[PDB]
Amino acid sequence: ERVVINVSGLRFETQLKTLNQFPDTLLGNPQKRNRYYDPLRNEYFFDRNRPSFDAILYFYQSGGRLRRPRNVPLDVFSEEIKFYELGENAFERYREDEGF
């Protein structure tokens, strides 16, 4: 099943199975992600930062590697990982990699 995630006009495509590998996150939990479903366009819409999302999706594709894009400021990216609920374990790995 192909899913389309529209982040402020920037459309990302992935498989449902890819998101569902991490069920305790926003995008991995149907009950949470369906709050962002857009029935007109058959996509999930987030009115949020665009350059961060490459790394949010890659977190799922890579089996849980969390990497800030160099072009995205630390504060901007931290707020996104919290919104997407990537979980304490990943947040710890990220804090370590970034310093704090």
Tokens of 81: 């990982």
- Number of other CB atoms surrounding residue 55 within 10 Å: 20
Q: By the 8 A CB rule, do 63 and 19 touch?
A: no
Q: For residue 46, which amino acid is it?
A: F
Tokens of 84: 């997407």
**Bridge pairing between strands 43-46 and 2-7:** parallel
The three-point CA angle 46-40-42 to 5° equals 65
Q: By the 8 A CB rule, do 8 and 46 touch?
A: yes
Q: What is the helix (H) or strand (E) element at residue 60, kind and residue range?
A: helix 53-61
What is the resolution of the experimental data for this entry, in Å? 1.7
Domains and CATH numbers, the chain: 1-100 (3.30.710.10)
Cα distance between residue 44 and residue 61, in whole Å:
18
In the chain, which residues are followed by a C-to-N distance beyond 2.5 Å, i.e. a gap? Answer: none
